Amino acid sequence: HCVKLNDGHLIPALGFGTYKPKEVPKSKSLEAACLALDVGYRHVDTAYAYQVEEEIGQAIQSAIAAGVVKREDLFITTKLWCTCFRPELVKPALEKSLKKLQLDYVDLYIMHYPVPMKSGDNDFPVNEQGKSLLDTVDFCDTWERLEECKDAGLVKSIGVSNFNHRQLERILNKPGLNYKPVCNQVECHLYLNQRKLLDYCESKDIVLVAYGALGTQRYKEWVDQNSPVLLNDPVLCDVAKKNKRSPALIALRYLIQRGIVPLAQSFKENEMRENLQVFGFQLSPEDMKTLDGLNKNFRYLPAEFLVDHPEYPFVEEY
Secondary structure, eight states: OEEEOTTSOEEESSEEEOOOOTTSOHHHHHHHHHHHHHHTOOEEEOOGGGTOHHHHHHHHHHHHHHTSOOGGGOEEEEEEOGGGOSHHHHHHHHHHHHHHHTOSOEEEEEESOSOOBOOSSOSSOBOTTSOBOBOOOOHHHHHHHHHHHHHTTSEEEEEEESOOHHHHHHHHTOTTOOSOOSEEEEEOBTTBOOHHHHHHHHHTTOEEEEESTTOOOOHHHHHOTTSOOGGGOHHHHHHHHHHTSOHHHHHHHHHHHTTOEEEEOOSOHHHHHHHHGGGGOOOOHHHHHHHHTTOOOOOSOOOGGGTTSTTOTTSSOO
16 A cells, blocks of 8 residues: 655555654664564654664665565655755765665655754754754755755655645745655644645645654653543544454554555554554544544644744644
């Protein structure tokens, strides 16, 4: 199951996410990527800023060396981080990611955010008060260098992450645009269903890719009864029981049926295998409408480290 991108390439309709919490040893990301490949994932989404590209690359090479997959069978995404948005730094940042990944090209390379930060080795440069050290780079200038990377054959498709409507319009309307973004990767789940941004993206043939697809599971959310937890939602539970699937699978299927490509994040074989079963059932029109009703516009990943920049993406309505 794939989704057609606006440049003719195809993206598998479910991806494997590789975000790694800081406390987790990086070797566990290597293990999880090998397991995901064995389970049957072919779309692997990573990012320079997750600091596990080397592990993901080693997993891929080990699976290729084992003969279980060929490179052409895989769809690999990585991301340009905020500290590398200066135009002269873009192609070298991709080349470094490719070296770490042990790849000659990626299938998809995306701007991680629309906001640039001070260049340098620290991914989260800060002043003595902890405020982010920000830059003045127009993301349209960064975009021109991603286009150059595509023309150089280092990446098949290019896109963005965490852009709002106004920012997508800036790219689409920029003078001398060569390639439209193929995707906008954003937080998206039953509690932040992204209807408005989705409808815009559909109108421009931009695919919405979802991270954080199961909402927050942080301790504080479970303790405060007033703060709803998506995986504990009683309406979701009713739909899950009706369809004889888990709440998590309902939550992922909801996104798939709206044309969104979710990234399923897990270190556990059983969950990896369950999530891949999302193509084995369909939600009815009534159930989709019930699930639409869960939206709360709860953004759990607001990227507060970017809030002081004029291009902070999340204050605007969409």
